[PDB]
Amino acid sequence: VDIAAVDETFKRLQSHKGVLGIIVINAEGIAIRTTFDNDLTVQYAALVSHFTVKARSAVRKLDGDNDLKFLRIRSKKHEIMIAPEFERSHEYYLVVVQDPSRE
Amino acid sequence: NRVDSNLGAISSTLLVELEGFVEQNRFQKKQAELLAIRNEEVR
Amino acid sequence: SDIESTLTRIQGHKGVIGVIIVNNQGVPLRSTFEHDAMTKQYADLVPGLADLARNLVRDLDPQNDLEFLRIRSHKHEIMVAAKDDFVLLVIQDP
Amino acid sequence: QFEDMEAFLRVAKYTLVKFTDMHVEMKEEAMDICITAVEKYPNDAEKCTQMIKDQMDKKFGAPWHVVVGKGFSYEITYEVRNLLYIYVGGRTAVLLWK
Amino acid sequence: AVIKNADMSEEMQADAVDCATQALEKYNIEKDIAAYIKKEFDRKHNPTWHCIVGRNFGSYVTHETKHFIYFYLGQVAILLFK
Amino acid sequence: LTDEEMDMCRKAFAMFDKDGSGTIDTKELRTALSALGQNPTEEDMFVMISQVDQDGSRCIEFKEFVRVIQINKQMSADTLDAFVALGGNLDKTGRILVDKLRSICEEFELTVNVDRLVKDADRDLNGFLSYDEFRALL
Amino acid sequence: DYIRTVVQLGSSVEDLIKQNNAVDIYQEYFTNVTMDHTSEAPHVKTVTVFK
Incomplete structure (x- = not known):
């Protein structure tokens, strides 16, 4: 069953070095799978939802025929990675948090 | 030093300090000798 | 003569189409473009994204800050180095 | 120069206005x-x-x-001499107006 | 749009939702959101409003008979009243 | 509003509340006035504090300190000093008397001076200086 | 459709995470090195000659 495939993708990603977290959030800002506790989850979901719709509106405004498949914000602690796939019937901006300092 | 530790401290002084302002007069006696003294060595 | 040499190196690689420096509020100073109908576009669209992202990062744990940011579109890689004085932009398709 | 959230919560017990x-x-x-x-x-x-x-x-x-x-965030219209904005516990914050 | 609690005429509930959504679309900070949502509705209908925008806030407030609205958009929350 | 005014405000607030109470009480204020020579009543100082005390504390603090410095300063940078140099004694007339400059060079007893400056700062080429060409002199 | 999207994004991000572990870009050499080896030859200065 493909549920084993997506959970396997979580261990594929999460087996990498330093990867603190993986989470999936849909267009209505509600997380679906987690890896964190519940409140760091909901504050990521709200913040990243608003930020990525602003960034996509920025890129679409800047050029009409160009969209984004990628987003990468930096800390001094952890490099949040956002990926979105803007489509109909699905738009699931998955977001990873990682850093190469650990381990 | 002898020709430019003087002449970059002679231009570093502050004559007037912080009626009774006659003390300033007395104060401006003192540093006068200062510049005179310094000038002599450069001369 | 180090800042301008780095500008001249960085503007002559295989994909770079524009380097921009913009101040706190605005005033894009030292662009690199043969016309200026789209510099102002960058200068008034992008630092909203830079400080909005500093809000997103810093909100979590206030010892934290933001340093850089990348947005990779289909045909562009908008890299912004935001900090306190200014916002800096480099545009490049890989 | 404390080095986490937790030492900040150890210090931050004051209720600054x-x-x-x-x-x-x-x-x-x-x-x-x-x-x-x-x-x-x-x-x-x-x-x-x-x-x-x-x-x-x-x-x-x-x-x-x-x-x-x-x-x-907030924007209110308030009659003067009756407004309180304080930070309690180093995190929670309270606006109060008539 | 999501509304959790309101006791007011729906014909200006539509006014509230169309006032808030274009505001949220336009600006990119959340103080000016609570600025605009009051300001433009203030020049529309009445002299007095109050409006809160954020996440995870608590409040007790005296209602108004036909002016009390508690929005919800995209894990961003709005309250406004007279 | 600026950044060094906060420095001088902190130093003067240190000077007034000298014991360390964190609040201006009446006795330290009278100590400051008595160091300046004044020993007024114990009813006018009450009214003075009551106009400056907003919080009801009977003791004024740093926010109130800078409030009074703010109102008195910015209510009433380089315009005034260069302006009132000599032309601001003339108040938007652009004609400065030569006799004022002769008096200035008279009183300060200066050893050698020739007034060719006013001869060679003459930009209307009449024998006087308007204010814009006066700044051009400065 | 949700499953297909998630595995597509997992593939792309997996490439990205490798990209960040490959060589670290954001790392200034000698961020904080205090020990400096310098020039310390003897200096003779005549402050004044008392004459």
């Missing part, structure tokens, strides 16, 4: 009743605001308005 237009006795009574509200119910904050403005409702003014929270 961010901005306020209140009399000194006004300020001390309102400040202490809000700290007692926040210590009384950390979990459910709705009934903290229950207690704060219903005490201020019976005693001080017929209209009152309390907002407690974690992260928010």
Whole structure:
């Protein structure tokens, strides 16, 4: 069953070095799978939802025929990675948090 | 030093300090000798 | 003569189409473009994204800050180095 | 120079008033009743605001308005000499206007 | 749009939702959101409003008979009243 | 509003509340006035504090300190000093008397001076200086 | 459709995470090195000659 495939993708990603977290959030800002506790989850979901719709509106405004498949914000602690796939019937901006300092 | 530790401290002084302002007069006696003294060595 | 040499190196690689420096509020100073109908576009669209992202990062744990940011579109890689004085932009398709 | 959230919460027990237009006795009574509200119910904050403005409702003014929270924004129109904005516990913050 | 609690005429509930959504679309900070949502509705209908925008806030407030609105958009929350 | 005014405000607030109370009480204020020579009543100082005390404390603090410095300063940078140099004694007339400059060079007893400056700062080429060409002199 | 999207994004991000572990870009050499080896030859200065 493909549920084993997506959970396997979580261990594929999460087996990498330093990867603190993986989470999936849909267009209505509600997380679906987690890896964190519940409140760091909901504050990521709200913040990243608003930020990525602003960034996509920025890129679409800047050029009409160009969209984004990628987003990468930096800390001094952890490099949040956002990926979105803007489509109909699905738009699931998955977001990873990682850093190469650990381990 | 002898020709430019003087002449970059002679231009570093502050004559007037912080009626009774006659003390300033007395104060401006003192540093006068200062510049005179310094000038002599450069001369 | 180090800042301008780095500008001249960085503007002559295989994909770079524009380097921009913009101040706190605005005033894009030292662009690199043969016309200026789209510099102002960058200068008034992008630092909203830079400080909005500093809000997103810093909100979590206030010892934290933001340093850089990348947005990779289909045909562009908008890299912004935001900090306190200014916002800096480099545009490049890989 | 503490090095986590937790040592910050060890230090941050003060209740700094961010901005306020209140009399000194006004300020001390309102400040202490809000700290007692926040210590009384950390979990459910709705009934903290229950207690704060219903005490201020019976005693001080017929209209009152309390907002407690974690992260928010606001723009209100308020009659002067009756505004309290304080930071409680180093995290939770409370706006209070008539 | 999501509404959790309101007691007011729906014909200006539509006014509230169309006032808030274009505001949220336009600006990119959340103080000016609570600025605009009051300001433009203030020049529309009445002299007095109050409006809160954020996440995880608590409040007790005296209602108004036909002016009390508690929005919800995209894990961003709005309150406004008279 | 600026950043060094906060420095001088902190130093002067240190000077007034000299014991360390964190609040200006009446006795330290009278100590400051008595160091300046004044020993007024114990009813006018009450009214003075009551106008400056906003919080009802009977003791004024740093916010009130800078409030009074703010109102008195910015209510009433380089315009005034260069302006009132000599032309601001003339108040938007652009004609400065030569006799004022002769008096200035008279009183300060200066050893050697020729007034060719006013001869060679003459930009209207009449024998006087308007204010814009006066700044051009400065 | 949700499953297909998630595995598509997992593939792309997996490439990205490798990209960040490959060589670290954001790392200034000698961020904080205090020990400096310098020039310390003897200096003779005549402050004044007392004559």
